Design a binder for this molecule. Structure first.
Ligand SMILES: O=C(O)CNC(=O)C(=O)O
Ligand SMILES: [Mg+2]
Ligand code: NI
Ligand SMILES: [Zn+2]
Length: 331
């Protein structure tokens, strides 16, 4: 069995191997990449996402989210407080202000330590989940706005045509902005390109061990667990590496830099934080191997998780028994 210790693998495709996205994902899997839950892909040196980032300041962040924490330094939840709209250029200035800028530090490790020690005492503002793309239309390779859609994959595998579309989202981050422990909707893959700015640190639990993380989370967030049998779908809970190690949960960590892709694999729980002002783009995708994960994915039916239009058909076709209860939570 390839990659049996479930380590995060890093790939360096040539320009020729960068042509066929599906083929390269399948290649990574042949080498065991999926066992980690997360892989890094460094594009060939010839490749570029676009010519420059000099003209992005007028993009609008209609609903910036202030991430307010509750709990203890290693075990906390976050809620999102909506703020007034601002442009990317306004957000970048805010991120660089004395209140929100990255502190002096020695290296990524020192910064990680400062994050875990101090995150809860601050409320950073995240420009997350903005529909759009920064890939130039002429970029032909690994262009997240031109991937095959999940609806087309389900149709190809299962023969059923369904409604829905699949488009990318932009994330504008600052120091301490945080993504809570989660897997993707319907335990899909995700792909994330860091377009510009400061790094993003990731933590991941191998898919084969995801239920260990779920059991710990039920213990650590006991009111939340009573409220919902899949509350990590709410994307609000954080658990530090120190706490995971204390409880024997297998995981790995890696830092993504500007110009790099990350791929998360079906049912690979992940969480992380941004080092300073940055812009990432991400989208969900599927392969034939995903179908069995989609069929088995947990669902939030308490009402909190509230998701996209396109999830309806996935539930309806892959999980018909769950459909009626799930839809009541959507309505
Ligand atoms: O970048 C972020 O804030 C969160 N991204 C992801 O969870 C992903 O790309 O799957
Ligand atoms: Mg602009
Ligand atoms: Ni994700
Ligand atoms: Zn729920």
């Amino acid at each position: 069995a390839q990659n049996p210790n479930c380590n995060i693998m890093i790939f360096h495709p040539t320009k020729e191997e960068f042509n066929d996205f599906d083929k390269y994902i399948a290649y990574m899997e042949s080498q065991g990449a999926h066992r980690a839950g997360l892989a890094k892909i460094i594009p060939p040196k010839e490749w570029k996402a676009r010519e420059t980032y000099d003209n992005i300041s007028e993009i609008l962040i209609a609903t910036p989210l202030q991430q307010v924490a509750s709990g203890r330094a290693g075990v906390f939840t976050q809620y999102h407080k909506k703020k007034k709209a601002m442009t990317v250029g306004e957000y970048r200035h805010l991120a660089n202000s004395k209140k929100y800028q990255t502190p002096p530090h020695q290296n990524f490790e020192d910064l990680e330590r400062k994050y875990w020690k101090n995150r809860i005492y601050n409320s950073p503002i995240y420009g997350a989940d903005i529909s759009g793309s920064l890939f130039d239309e002429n970029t032909k390779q690994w262009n997240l706005g031109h991937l095959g859609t999940i609806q087309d994959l389900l149709e190809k595998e299962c023969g059923v045509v369904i409604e829905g579309v699949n488009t990318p989202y932009l994330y504008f981050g600052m120091w301490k902005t945080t993504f809570a422990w989660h897997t993707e909707d319907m335990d899909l893959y995700s792909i994330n390109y860091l377009h510009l700015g400061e790094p993003k640190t990731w933590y991941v639990v191998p898919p084969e061990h995801g239920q260990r993380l779920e059991r710990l989370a039920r213990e650590l967030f006991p009111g939340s667990s009573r409220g919902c049998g899949a509350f990590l779908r709410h994307k609000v809970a954080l658990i530090s590496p120190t706490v995971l190690k204390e409880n024997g949960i297998p995981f790995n960590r890696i830092t993504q830099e500007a110009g790099e892709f990350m791929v998360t694999f079906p049912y690979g729980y992940h969480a992380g934080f941004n080092h300073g002002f940055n812009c990432a783009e991400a989208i969900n995708f599927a392969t034939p191997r995903w179908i069995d994960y989609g069929k088995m994915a947990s669902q939030c039916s308490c009402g909190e998780a509230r998701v996209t239009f396109s999830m309806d058909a996935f539930v309806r076709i892959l999980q018909p028994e769950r459909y009626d209860l799930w839809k009541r939570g959507q309505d």
